[PDB]
């Protein structure tokens, strides 16, 4: 009942799914409960981008304007005059959670409806992309627009990063971006022992939604793929990163990973 205890300590709802790809062992807590996916969708969106382009095609320069900027544009706001390549957009999106970068990438693959179709093609019938930033963060309880589940996000992230939805050189680009994410140090990363490599993508949205999805490599062994999702009752709720860090610690102990 440690996940329940965390829900109690943090006045939140948790959604957990974790798969040890070494043993096929699984840790689940509300694994099929929907949450707003928030910026975790950025990781899947780059998976789809990568599928649709050669590596060299990522060097395509995307010109854009001030009207492409939205609520959080840490990288894209600096390069309006020069544009940015698709590769640079992917970097910004994954490593800084640049919202305008996600929108520009979405545009290049044909929009939310197109993303949805490519996700269905790789076998995800759950994740429901419908809107761009900033609106995709606004999901009320019981709505399904721009939501997914912990099980579906783990399944989809594994498929792109570790299985055969991408060729090895494209898996490597995705993995390396997510390993070097700047936004996640207080989340899954904080619940895994020092030195263990972590690839992650965070998210935050309305109703105090606070998410992280990750691949976690022990020093030797097959990786664990994990989604820790959370949300709260009030629309303007605050979140606490420590919830996600502590949930991760529970998952790691439940998988017999602390230590090795």
Numbering used by the authors: 31 to 57, 59 to 83, 86 to 238, 240 to 252, 254 to 295
Paper text:
β-lactamases inactivate β-lactam antibiotics by hydrolyzing and “opening” their signature β-lactam ring. In serine-based β-lactamases of Class A, C and D, this hydrolytic process is executed in the deacylation step involving an activated water molecule carrying out nucleophilic attack on the enzyme-substrate acyl adduct ES*. Here we report structural and computational studies of Class A β-lactamase PenP with Glu166Tyr mutation that analyze the interactions between this critical water molecule, termed WAT_Nu, and other components of the active site during a full cycle of hydrolysis. In summary, by analyzing the reaction intermediates observed in the active site of a Class A β-lactamase hydrolyzing a β-lactam substrate, our study has uncovered critical features within the active site that coordinate and activate the water molecule for hydrolysis.
In the active site of the apo structure, the mutated residue Tyr166 adopts the same conformation as the Glu166 residue in the wild-type structure but the bulky side chain of Tyr166 extends much closer toward the catalytic residue Ser70 and forms a stable hydrogen bond with it (distance ~2.8 Å). The Glu166Tyr mutation has little impact on the overall structure of the active site as nearby residues like Ser70, Lys73 and Asn170 adopt essentially identical conformation as in wild-type structure. Notably, the key catalytic water molecule, termed WAT_Nu for its potential role as the hydrolytic nucleophile, forms totally six hydrogen bonds with partners including the side chains of Ser70, Tyr166 and Asn170 as well as the mainchain carbonyl of Ala237, the main chain amide of Ser70 plus a possible sulfate ion from the bulk solvent. Compared to a similar water molecule observed in the wild-type TEM-1 structure, WAT_Nu in Glu166Tyr mutant structure is located closer to Ser70 and Asn170, but farther away from Lys73. This difference is probably due to the bulkier side of Tyr166 as compared to Glu166, resulting in WAT_Nu being “pushed” away from Lys73 and toward Ser70 instead. In the apo structure with ES* absent, WAT_Nu is coordinated by a network of hydrogen bonds involving Glu166Tyr, Asn170 and Ala237.
